[PDB]
Design an enzyme around this catalytic site. Sequence first.
Site, short mmCIF file in Angstrom:
data_model
loop_
_atom_site.label_atom_id
_atom_site.label_comp_id
_atom_site.label_asym_id
_atom_site.label_seq_id
_atom_site.Cartn_x
_atom_site.Cartn_y
_atom_site.Cartn_z
N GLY A 198 29.12 38.28 43.18
CA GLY A 198 30.23 37.59 43.81
C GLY A 198 31.50 38.38 43.63
O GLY A 198 31.49 39.53 43.19
N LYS A 199 32.61 37.75 44.00
CA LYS A 199 33.92 38.31 43.74
C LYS A 199 34.31 38.05 42.29
O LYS A 199 33.90 37.06 41.68
CB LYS A 199 34.97 37.72 44.69
N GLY A 200 35.11 38.95 41.74
CA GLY A 200 35.58 38.80 40.38
C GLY A 200 37.02 39.22 40.22
O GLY A 200 37.77 39.26 41.20
N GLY B 212 37.89 42.89 42.02
CA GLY B 212 36.87 43.66 42.72
C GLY B 212 35.58 42.88 42.84
O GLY B 212 35.47 41.73 42.40
N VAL C 42 31.47 42.47 42.11
CA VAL C 42 30.56 42.67 40.99
C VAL C 42 29.13 42.57 41.50
O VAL C 42 28.80 41.68 42.29
CB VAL C 42 30.82 41.65 39.86
CG1 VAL C 42 30.07 42.07 38.61
CG2 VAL C 42 32.30 41.55 39.57
N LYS D 55 31.06 45.91 38.10
CA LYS D 55 32.28 45.64 38.85
C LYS D 55 32.82 46.95 39.40
O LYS D 55 32.92 47.95 38.68
CB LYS D 55 33.34 44.97 37.98
CG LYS D 55 34.72 45.01 38.60
CD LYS D 55 35.72 44.19 37.81
CE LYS D 55 35.33 42.73 37.82
NZ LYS D 55 36.06 41.98 36.76
N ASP E 52 41.58 33.39 27.58
CA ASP E 52 41.19 32.65 28.78
C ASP E 52 39.84 31.99 28.54
O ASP E 52 38.88 32.17 29.30
CB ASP E 52 41.17 33.56 30.01
CG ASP E 52 41.17 32.78 31.31
OD1 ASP E 52 41.48 31.58 31.27
OD2 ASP E 52 40.86 33.38 32.36
C1 LIG Z 1 26.33 36.12 36.41
N1 LIG Z 1 26.10 37.24 35.52
C2 LIG Z 1 27.05 38.09 35.14
N2 LIG Z 1 26.74 38.95 34.16
C3 LIG Z 1 27.69 39.81 33.80
C4 LIG Z 1 28.95 39.85 34.41
C5 LIG Z 1 30.03 40.74 34.10
C6 LIG Z 1 31.19 40.73 34.79
C7 LIG Z 1 32.36 41.56 34.39
C8 LIG Z 1 33.50 40.93 33.90
C9 LIG Z 1 34.64 41.66 33.64
C10 LIG Z 1 34.68 43.03 33.84
C11 LIG Z 1 35.94 43.80 33.59
N3 LIG Z 1 36.91 43.57 34.47
C12 LIG Z 1 38.09 44.19 34.32
C13 LIG Z 1 39.14 43.90 35.34
C14 LIG Z 1 38.32 45.06 33.26
C15 LIG Z 1 37.32 45.31 32.34
C16 LIG Z 1 36.10 44.67 32.50
O1 LIG Z 1 35.04 44.83 31.67
C17 LIG Z 1 35.20 45.70 30.55
C18 LIG Z 1 33.54 43.67 34.31
C19 LIG Z 1 32.39 42.94 34.58
CL1 LIG Z 1 31.00 43.79 35.14
C20 LIG Z 1 31.33 39.84 35.94
O2 LIG Z 1 32.25 39.92 36.75
N4 LIG Z 1 30.36 38.88 36.11
C21 LIG Z 1 30.60 37.85 37.13
C22 LIG Z 1 31.76 36.94 36.75
O3 LIG Z 1 31.34 36.05 35.74
C23 LIG Z 1 32.43 35.26 35.25
C24 LIG Z 1 33.08 34.48 36.38
N5 LIG Z 1 34.31 33.82 35.93
C25 LIG Z 1 33.33 35.39 37.56
O4 LIG Z 1 32.16 36.17 37.86
C26 LIG Z 1 29.16 38.89 35.42
N6 LIG Z 1 28.23 38.01 35.79
#
Ligand SMILES: CNc1ncc2cc(-c3ccc(-c4nc(C)ccc4OC)cc3Cl)c(=O)n(C[C@H]3OC[C@H](N)CO3)c2n1
Length: 264
Positions: free
Chosen positions: A18-20, A23, A25, A40, A131
């Site tokens: 999805g979106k995160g 960017g 992911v 991501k 958060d």
């Molecule tokens: C469902 N399974 C699942 N497993 C793992 C992840 C990991 C991330 C994730 C998170 C943060 C960063 C990040 N980012 C920045 C800007 C800087 C540094 C950062 O990392 C060092 C990078 C990643 Cl790769 C991820 O977006 N998601 C999806 C995410 O979930 C939470 C929800 N609130 C939104 O959707 C995940 N999902």
Amino acid sequence: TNLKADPEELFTKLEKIGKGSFGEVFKGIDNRTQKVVAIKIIDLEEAEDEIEDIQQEITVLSQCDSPYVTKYYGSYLKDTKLWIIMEYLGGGSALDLLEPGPLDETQIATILREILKGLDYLHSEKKIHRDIKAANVLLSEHGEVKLADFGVATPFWMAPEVIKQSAYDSKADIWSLGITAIELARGEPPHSELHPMKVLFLIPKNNPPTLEGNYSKPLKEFVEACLNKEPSFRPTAKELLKHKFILRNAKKTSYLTELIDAHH
Ligand SMILES: CNc1ncc2cc(-c3ccc(-c4nc(C)ccc4OC)cc3Cl)c(=O)n(C[C@H]3OC[C@H](N)CO3)c2n1
């Protein structure tokens, strides 16, 4: 941050999660290990203002080595696109699993307890999540619970001293956890139907929210312990793991597999 190895050769995206933050992911595969990863990808030209934010979250998570914090694997920069590689958690977020239906207190306690172990690891390492909320708690396929999407330095989960921009410490996370407990028991934080700017003054002004409804008293007392307007009167994450609500209700993390299977 690796800039020489091509991330498109190292990793096989398979689907968009999805979106995160800033960017998209992807559920992916490390081609060397064939373990599943979260990827991501951020276009840094399209998000120039938030780059220090990106840098700060990469820095804080690269310093965490705990079963309760989403593991960090590295960063890759290909042209203008930054790839951030993290552990993949196939059970989704805690908020996703509240959607199949209201959680019972066994599930609430088990998730709360795992979050608390994450908070206690962080707070002992002199780190703050900033958060804590259901959407930022991710679960593996086998029920393990881990913290993700760290804040750096919506108000519904914010501590009153955070809102009033005072210097805040680990006790802000404890407040956010108390709000998260309400979220897991009710589906959404207090004041969720109100405009954010209203909530911005309600939280400093009003009494702490309490968990209303037909719940056991220890759950209500867990929540109110966390939700104290004075931050220095909030227990540590270590204290709360011994709270009667956690001791009486929390199970093994594998118990959550059933709830995760409901979501798929
Ligand atoms: C469902 N399974 C699942 N497993 C793992 C992840 C990991 C991330 C994730 C998170 C943060 C960063 C990040 N980012 C920045 C800007 C800087 C540094 C950062 O990392 C060092 C990078 C990643 Cl790769 C991820 O977006 N998601 C999806 C995410 O979930 C939470 C929800 N609130 C939104 O959707 C995940 N999902």
